[PDB]
Structures are given as structure tokens and as C-alpha cells.
Curated annotation (Swiss-Prot):
Notes concerning its domains: The cysteine framework is I (CC-C-C). Alpha4/7 pattern.
Location of this chain's protein in the cell: Secreted
Similarity field: Belongs to the conotoxin A superfamily.
S-S bonds: 2-8, 3-16
UniProt name for this protein: Alpha-conotoxin LvIA
Site (May play a crucial role for the selectivity for alpha-3-beta-2 nAChR): residue numbering on this chain: 11
Full-sequence portion shown in this chain: 21 to 36 of 37
């Protein structure tokens, strides 16, 4: 889950 991923969190502003 990209939200639990600090790096991937950034590229998913729609989720995170």
C-alpha cells in the first residue's frame, strides 16, 4: 500500500 510507503505516498495525492 502506497500510503504506508512514504515515497509512493507522495505520488498518490488522490489516495494519500
Amino acid at each position: 500500500g502506497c500510503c504506508s510507503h512514504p515515497a509512493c505516498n507522495v505520488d498518490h495525492p488522490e489516495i494519500c
